[PDB]
Amino acid sequence: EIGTGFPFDPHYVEVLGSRMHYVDVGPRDGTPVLFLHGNPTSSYLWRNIIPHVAPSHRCIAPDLIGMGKSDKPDLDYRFDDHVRYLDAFIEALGLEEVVLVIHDWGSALGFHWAKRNPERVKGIAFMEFIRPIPTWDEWPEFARELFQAFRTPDVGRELIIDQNAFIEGILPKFVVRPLTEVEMDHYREPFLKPVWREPLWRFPNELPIAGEPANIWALVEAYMNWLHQSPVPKLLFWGTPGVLIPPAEAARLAESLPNLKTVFIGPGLHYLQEDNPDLIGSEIARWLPALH
Amino acid sequence: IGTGFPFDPHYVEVLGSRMHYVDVGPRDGTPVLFLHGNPTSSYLWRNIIPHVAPSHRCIAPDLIGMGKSDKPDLDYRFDDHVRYLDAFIEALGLEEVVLVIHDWGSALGFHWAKRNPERVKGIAFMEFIRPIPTWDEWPEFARELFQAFRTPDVGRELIIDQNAFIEGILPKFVVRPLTEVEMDHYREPFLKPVWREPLWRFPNELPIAGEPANIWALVEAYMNWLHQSPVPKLLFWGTPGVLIPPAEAARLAESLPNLKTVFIGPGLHYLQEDNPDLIGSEIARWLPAL
Numbered sequence: 299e300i301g302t303g304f305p306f307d308p309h310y311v312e313v314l315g316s317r318m319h320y321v322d323v324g325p326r327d328g329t330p331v332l333f334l335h336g337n338p339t340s341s342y343l344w345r346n347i348i349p350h351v352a353p354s355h356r357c358i359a360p361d362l363i364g365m366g367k368s369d370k371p372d373l374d375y376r377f378d379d380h381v382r383y384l385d386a387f388i389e390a391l392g393l394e395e396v397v398l399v400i401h402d403w404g405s406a407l408g409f410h411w412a413k414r415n416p417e418r419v420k421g422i423a424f425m426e427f428i429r430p431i432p433t434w435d436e437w438p439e440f441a442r443e444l445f446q447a448f449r450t451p452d453v454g455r456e457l458i459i460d461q462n463a464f465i466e467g468i469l470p471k472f473v474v475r476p477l478t479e480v481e482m483d484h485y486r487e488p489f490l491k492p493v494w495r496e497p498l499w500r501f502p503n504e505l506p507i508a509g510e511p512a513n514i515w516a517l518v519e520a521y522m523n524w525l526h527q528s529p530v531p532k533l534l535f536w537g538t539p540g541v542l543i544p545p546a547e548a549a550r551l552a553e554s555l556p557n558l559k560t561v562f563i564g565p566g567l568h569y570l571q572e573d574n575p576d577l578i579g580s581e582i583a584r585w586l587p588a589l590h
Numbered sequence: 591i592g593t594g595f596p597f598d599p600h601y602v603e604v605l606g607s608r609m610h611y612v613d614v615g616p617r618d619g620t621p622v623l624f625l626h627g628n629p630t631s632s633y634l635w636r637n638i639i640p641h642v643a644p645s646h647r648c649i650a651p652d653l654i655g656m657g658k659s660d661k662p663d664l665d666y667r668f669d670d671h672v673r674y675l676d677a678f679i680e681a682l683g684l685e686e687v688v689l690v691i692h693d694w695g696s697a698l699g700f701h702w703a704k705r706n707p708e709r710v711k712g713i714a715f716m717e718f719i720r721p722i723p724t725w726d727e728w729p730e731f732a733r734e735l736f737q738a739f740r741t742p743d744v745g746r747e748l749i750i751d752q753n754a755f756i757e758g759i760l761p762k763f764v765v766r767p768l769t770e771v772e773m774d775h776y777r778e779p780f781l782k783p784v785w786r787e788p789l790w791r792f793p794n795e796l797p798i799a800g801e802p803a804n805i806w807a808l809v810e811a812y813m814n815w816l817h818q819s820p821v822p823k824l825l826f827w828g829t830p831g832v833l834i835p836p837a838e839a840a841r842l843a844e845s846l847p848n849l850k851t852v853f854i855g856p857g858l859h860y861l862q863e864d865n866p867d868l869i870g871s872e873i874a875r876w877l878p879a880l
């Protein structure tokens with residue numbers, strides 16, 4: 299029964315201004331074994347191979363830049379981009395000599411690194427690796443039309459980006475046994491529809507206005523009532539005309555909040571820190587010792 | 591007004607995610623906890639912290655999904671932020687704190703303070719979230735936009751597609767002009783993302799029938815190196831395979847020096863998913879001989 303779990307603590311190293319994730323298990327010394335995945339996978343692909351090797355050797359399995367749990371900087375993600383990031387990853391880890399275990403585009407990276415660093419490679423295990431394919435007749439007939447479409451302008455991006463054809467189509471098509479839903483979800487995870495700007499939209503939809511949404515209205519009314527009764531020392535900064543706290547609200551708070559000091563900061567709307575940070579910071583500093 | 595952000599990054603793992611935070615000033619004493627709101631980050635506090643750090647530890651987290659913190663798959667409702675900030679505070683082992691809070695950071699800070707009243711030694715606040723009884727009390731110059739933000743479909747087109755909260759509201763809500771350097775700090779966490787670009791670029795780099803020529807030459811070059819190199823080699827292959835069918839495995843057995851070959855049985859391309867135990871155990875048996 300082939301394992302679906304990924305029982306590996308995350309490790310990250312900063313590389314050319316981004317972070318790359320990697321598996322790092324086994325002893326600390328000896329020759330490390332460096333596992334390189336390809337498209338559209340991650341170190342997840344090695345999850346059931348690493349445990350055979352970890353008892354005797356250090357196992358390092360990075361996620362290529364833009365993949366797995368690695369950062370996704372704004373690159374073209376051409377082969378040369380992957381070369382740069384993997385080169386810097388190996389150097390950031392201070393690796394000397396390695397054994398390579400490589401697959402697909404990770405094999406193009408590994409072989410290219412090995413050719414440039416032959417003294418540092420003690421062995422290469424490889425499988426289903428990138429070699430020059432002399433004609434499309436040498437490409438498997440059952441996947442020829444699809445890969446030709448991937449390489450066809452516009453249509454390739456529709457299939458791979460809009461329809462996720464490489465994860466939903468190629469990946470199970472190129473495994474003989476059936477992948478489970480848990481396994482597909484691990485492969486889907488780095489490429490789900492991005493969170494992106496969701497937090498910025500959800501916040502205004504939570505603002506407590508005219509009783510709605512009711513759960514936030516109740517919670518905010520509760521802490522406003524707490525503030526009205528609490529002896530906690532309070533410091534209010536307000537600007538004019540303000541947004542949430544106009545002058546009239548500042549005066550209401552002066553009437554209603556115990557133990558309140560109020561500072562007017564001058565012109566201000568909502569992000570008062572951008573209009574008079576020096577007064578805000580200096581007044582906080584002056585107020586803090588009075589809290590002893 | 592300074593535009594730089596001269597604070598070393600710190601990260602802490604919270605509920606499976608990394609949260610970024612500023613941590614400056616003395617390492618002990620009561621800490622001052624700065625909480626930003628929408629659509630900002632610890633960057634909002636960059637010119638206020640230096641007044642406070644001489645006397646007190648200053649901690650300024652980026653809320654989950656914002657700043658340099660991770661972006662897990664959440665709804666990003668208020669309750670999500672409550673959970674991650676609660677766990678952030680406990681992860682740092684904070685006991686008593688002074689709060690300095692703004693906007694949704696004030697809703698988070700006041701709500702935390704009410705639930706933990708023994709641990710709050712003071713609260714500084716500004717432009718904070720309070721119950722707004724009617725839209726009448728929302729300033730007219732921003733009222734239509736916030737009504738639109740809360741309208742189905744329209745609100746997402748504005749905030750997500752057009753970045754209205756960063757490109758519109760943020761400078762609308764500062765009296766002086768924000769500089770482009772400041773705008774770029776505020777834009778950075780929310781730049782249009784990379785997404786699936788690597789998945790499409792890879793098949794367009796495959797060396798097939800000579801193209802693309804730069805990859806063809808590079809791949810030919812390392813294949814020529816492999817054919818002359820004495821390095822120990824171990825090839826796993828399956829049937830029918832994809833890139834390495836049986837006839838190609840046989841050709842490699844003839845042409846590569848110092849090669850051991852292992853047939854794994856049925857296999858196409860991701861052989862690790864069809865026979866991981868044979869691949870892993872054969873690598874383990876092979877490594878001592880190196």
Ligand SMILES: [Cl-]
Nearest residue numbers: 501502505628
């Ligand atoms: Cl908001």
Ligand SMILES: [Cl-]
Nearest residue numbers: 337792793796
């Ligand atoms: Cl590919």
